[PDB]
Amino acid sequence: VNSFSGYLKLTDNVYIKNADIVEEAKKVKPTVVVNAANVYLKHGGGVAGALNKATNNAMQVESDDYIATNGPLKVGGSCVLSGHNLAKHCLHVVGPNVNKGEDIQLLKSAYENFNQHEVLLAPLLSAGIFGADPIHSLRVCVDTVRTNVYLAVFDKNLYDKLVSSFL
């Protein structure tokens, strides 16, 4: 039993809610919140900009030190950093950005990072301003992640479309 509330069960291990991931994290304080990051951990907009703003820019400060030490992530890769006031940990995961011309097949590799964590609060990777098809991303999530994932989908119209089309 966990403290996630109001989710629709999609499969044995995947759950979904029309909610802002920032608000879900504030309420639940999950062990792991997933950020939809880029390879430079520049949290300018989208999920990343919203999470970082909620940390009062502490996520960005920590991220800049991470990059200075380690260099950029790979597309499809991840790193574990602090969750600050939102969660114990933040798993920064880089899905392919279609608006940058990145290969959509790397989306499966991106979701594989979730399997290193027993329970996660996550956004839909590569959706929104990353330019991929959200129906496809939900499908890849369900077919790749085996651990327990709670998907917060902020956009109400998108949430309705995802539920009504889910096979």
Ligand X SMILES: Cc1cccc(C[C@H](CO)Nc2ncnc3[nH]ccc23)c1
CB of residue 139 vs ligand X: minimum separation in angstroms? 15
Q: Residue by residue, what is the 3-state secondary structure of 13-57?
A: CEEEEECCHHHHHHHHCCCEEEEECCCCCCCCCHHHHHHHHHCCC
Q: How far apart are CA 79 and CA 81, in angstroms?
A: 6
Which residue, 81 or 125, is less far from ligand X as judged by CB? Answer: 125
Q: How many CB atoms lie within 10 A of CB 35?
A: 29
Which residue, 27 or 65, is less far from ligand X as judged by CB? Answer: 27
CB of residue 115 vs ligand X: minimum separation in angstroms? 19
CB of residue 69 vs ligand X: minimum separation in angstroms? 25
Q: How far apart are CA 110 and CA 76, in angstroms?
A: 4
In this chain, which residue has its C-beta nearest to ligand X?
128
Which residue, 35 or 81, is less far from ligand X as judged by CB? Answer: 35
Which residues lie near ligand X (CB under 6 A)? 20-22, 36, 46-47, 50, 123-124, 127-130, 152-155, 158
